Curated annotation (Swiss-Prot):
There is a cross-link at residue 21 (Glycyl lysine isopeptide (Lys-Gly) (interchain with G-Cter in ubiquitin)). This is Calmodulin-1. The modification N-acetylalanine is found at residue 1. It is found in: Cytoplasm, Cytoskeleton, Spindle; Cytoplasm, Cytoskeleton, Spindle pole; Cytoplasm, Cytoskeleton, Microtubule organizing center, Centrosome; Cell projection, Cilium, Flagellum. The keyword Metal-binding applies. The gene is CALM1. It comes from Homo sapiens. Ca(2+) 1 binds at residues 20, 22, 24, 26, 31. (Microbial infection) Inactivated by S.flexneri OspC1 and OspC3 proteins, which specifically bind the apo-form of calmodulin, thereby preventing calcium-binding and activity. One of its GO terms (cellular component) is voltage-gated potassium channel complex. The N-terminal and C-terminal lobes of CALM bind to the C-terminus of KCNQ1 in a clamp-like conformation. Binding of CALM C-terminus to KCNQ1 is calcium-independent but is essential for assembly of the structure. Binding of CALM N-terminus to KCNQ1 is calcium-dependent and regulates electrophysiological activity of the channel. The C-lobe interacts with KCNN4 channels in a calcium-independent manner, whereas the N-lobe interacts with the S4-S5 linker of KCNN4 in a calcium-dependent manner playing a role as calcium sensor and gating the channel. GO terms for biological process: autophagosome membrane docking; calcineurin-mediated signaling; cellular response to interferon-beta; cellular response to type II interferon; detection of calcium ion; G protein-coupled receptor signaling pathway; G2/M transition of mitotic cell cycle; long-term synaptic potentiation. This protein has four functional calcium-binding sites. The chain holds residues 2 to 80 of 149 of the full protein. Keywords: Acetylation, Calcium, Cell projection, Cilium, Cytoplasm, Cytoskeleton, Disease variant, Flagellum, Host-virus interaction, Isopeptide bond, Long QT syndrome, Metal-binding, Methylation, Phosphoprotein, Repeat, Ubl conjugation.
Length: 79
């Protein structure tokens, strides 16, 4: 896929459902911290605030399908 975007999108598609708490197609800082919790963890929208702002490319302070995709992808990059 060049960026394992295919295999990812696949899951990201079904996952998006979860990631999208509000269900407005947009993943709010909360929506992000929400999922994380489902992973047992218990992060704060604050810490995630720095992330959302980071991932947020369009510029505003929120995530999205294409936005998050980058986050996750770039996630493995960092590591
Ligand atoms: Ca955004």
């Amino acid at each position: 896929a060049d960026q394992l975007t295919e295999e990812q999108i696949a899951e990201f598609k079904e996952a998006f459902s979860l990631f999208d708490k509000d269900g407005d197609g947009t993943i709010t800082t909360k929506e992000l911290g929400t999922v994380m919790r489902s992973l047992g963890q218990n992060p704060t929208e604050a810490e995630l605030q720095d992330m959302i702002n980071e991932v947020d490319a369009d510029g505003d302070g929120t995530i999205d399908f294409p936005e998050f995709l980058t986050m996750m992808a770039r996630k493995m990059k960092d590591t």
